[PDB]
């Protein structure tokens with residue numbers, strides 16, 4: 001579970017926000033892209049796995065599951081590519097909630113930047129620092145450190 | 150010590166690679182940009198600080214030290230903006246070496262992507278996973294987790 005991430009795609013202002021959630025902590029990375037392609041998703045995964053020890057990715061849809069570019073990135077970075085079927089029905093609800101919370105933070109910061117990408121990065125910052133008392137940022141670091149030991 | 154990062158700018162193929170180094174571990178983040186501007190540097194810092202607990206940034210040059218956009222990003226993300234003066238002369242030598250090693254990895258992966266940005270992310274991945282037997286990736290996590298406890 002320290003190595004499991006879930007991909008998530010949401011829309012705002014005619015653009016796409018691509019999100020990876022570290023499942024055990026709720027810590028997130030996110031980027032704005034014009035549209036979700038195999039290439040964009042493969043590139044995002046490569047960035048993510050250079051930064052965190054990514055063992056498993058649950059892809060956000062069947063297109064990214066199927067995508068040969070996505071599979072090439074997962075091969076490259078040593079990631080086990082998995083489906084994102086919520087065999088646990090609570091998974092749908094956790095992600096739906098996260099999308100709504102992210103969008104609310106984006107709306108709270110939206111006037112502090114011209115570009116959506118800036119607002120989304122501000123939202124990422126606030127989400128990962130929010131104490132719920134540990135933050136998601138602290139949780140992921142603790143989970144991975146325990147693992148290394 | 151857990152919160153100290155150093156900005157570093159290097160060139161390749163007529164483009165700019167902006168690097169942040171976590172000093173205590175040697176762990177890096179990097180991006181390709183067409184030129185180093187205040188806005189690009191500010192945006193990169195905002196991404197960095199949503200991801201890692203960034204307390205201090207030693208900026209890479211006086212322009213970025215001076216830049217009001219960079220100061221705005223550091224204010225935003227709660228970062229102390231500092232100069233990068235190598236009062237310890239071993240600092241220039243560490244960065245120069247890091248730049249040469251990154252450029253060497255990029256040349257080794259260069260044919261595996263059309264775009265420089267992809268090669269640079271492959272280089273980031275390889276750098277952070279390289280065991281020296283702990284990796285930079287393992288050191289940053291252990292250092293930050295030790296600090297949290």
Ligand SMILES: C[N@H+](Cc1ccccc1C(=O)NCC1CCCCC1)Cc1ccc2c(c1C(=O)O)OCO2
Pocket residue numbers: 111112113114115116117118119188189191192195218221222225
């Ligand atoms: C040039 N604008 C001016 C601006 C315009 C409108 C509203 C607020 C501001 C403003 O100064 N906000 C303060 C924040 C600036 C970001 C760091 C945190 C403080 C900001 C900016 C800088 C760098 C970027 C941007 C943007 C963007 O506007 O999206 O997009 C990609 O790299």
Ligand SMILES: C[N@H+](Cc1ccccc1C(=O)NCC1CCCCC1)Cc1ccc2c(c1C(=O)O)OCO2
Pocket residue numbers: 039040042043046069072073076260261262263264265266267268
């Ligand atoms: C479309 N190209 C094809 C290609 C072209 C030339 C040489 C090798 C390859 C190739 O297949 N590389 C193997 C894989 C290595 C891990 C990453 C996934 C590709 C790859 C690619 C995908 C996504 C991107 C890119 C690029 C890029 O070429 O820079 O740039 C921004 O998002």
